[PDB]
């Protein structure tokens, strides 16, 4: 739970990109303070959503990270 | 057994001996009604201020009636525990020895009929305390914050 919290807080309030003018658009859009307060949120906003890149990972460089995602479960 | 300053001290034993649940020199019904009015004045606060109708001008009566209902439920529970554990002619199970060793008369509070008087007193006292907290919170209500 500690590491999940860390990942979400960083990707929702610190990490991200900065525009040419200086506007910040964080990697996840800054929905922590409004979607970390519901377990259903944790499913929807963080656990389900940010699990995309591992699950479409077949047929790419990252495909190894995909395979483990099953054996790990197994 | 261990005897730390907490479990053994003049002031702590004094305080615990002065509250109604142990002053055997009073009728059990009166101790019951005293603890009842105590808890009645107690519980009204959060139940009213943070209830599900706090943003409504009825929140006072709402919280107070809810407190009264909880008091009634707990009085039911008290009577039920008493009729469950206390038989109607059998002796008492109260501590009859003090710290020095004075053999104490069996506390009538720890009897079936005594527990019944206690329950009735507690219920009446809780009702009175709740209505008193209401009348002091919504009529004469300047020096408080709510």
């Amino acid at each position: 739970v500690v590491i999940f919290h860390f990942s979400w807080k960083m990707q929702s309030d610190v990490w991200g990109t900065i525009s040419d003018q200086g506007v910040v658009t964080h990697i996840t859009g800054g929905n922590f303070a409004q979607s970390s307060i519901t377990i259903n949120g944790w499913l929807r906003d963080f656990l389900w959503a940010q699990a995309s890149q591992v699950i479409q990972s077949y047929g790419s460089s990252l495909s190894a990270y995909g395979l483990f995602f099953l054996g790990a479960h197994f | 057994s261990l005897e730390t300053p907490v479990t053994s001290s003049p002031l702590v034993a004094w305080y615990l001996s002065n509250l109604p649940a142990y002053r055997t020199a009073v009728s059990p019904l009166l101790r019951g009604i005293e603890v009842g009015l105590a808890h009645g004045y107690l519980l009204v606060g959060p139940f009213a201020l943070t209830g599900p109708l706090r943003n409504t001008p009825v929140h006072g009566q709402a919280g107070t009636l809810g407190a009264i209902g909880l008091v009634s439920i707990l009085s039911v529970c008290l009577t039920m525990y008493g009729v469950a554990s206390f038989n109607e002619g059998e002796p008492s199970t109260a501590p009859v020895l003090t710290l020095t060793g004075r053999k104490k008369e069996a506390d009538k509070l720890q009897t079936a009929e005594g527990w019944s008087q206690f329950t009735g007193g507690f219920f009446f006292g809780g009702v009175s305390g709740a209505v008193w907290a209401y009348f002091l919170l919504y009529v004469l209500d300047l020096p408080y914050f709510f």
Partner: protein
Amino acid sequence: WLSGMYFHGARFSNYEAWLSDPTHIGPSAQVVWPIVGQEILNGDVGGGFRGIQITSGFFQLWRASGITSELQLY
């Protein structure tokens, strides 16, 4: 273990290209043998290199200590 790490940095990394400009060049320090179709593992990491991307974070250290040459790793 440390020796293996420094070796694989020396003989199998793109460390010099990474030092050239570390802004948008992915640290890679592991290539895989092209035998059983796992060539896809050697994905695009930039800088004219192919290799499994790493996240150990050695490269920031090797740039702090001014290694800046494969002879030193060797």
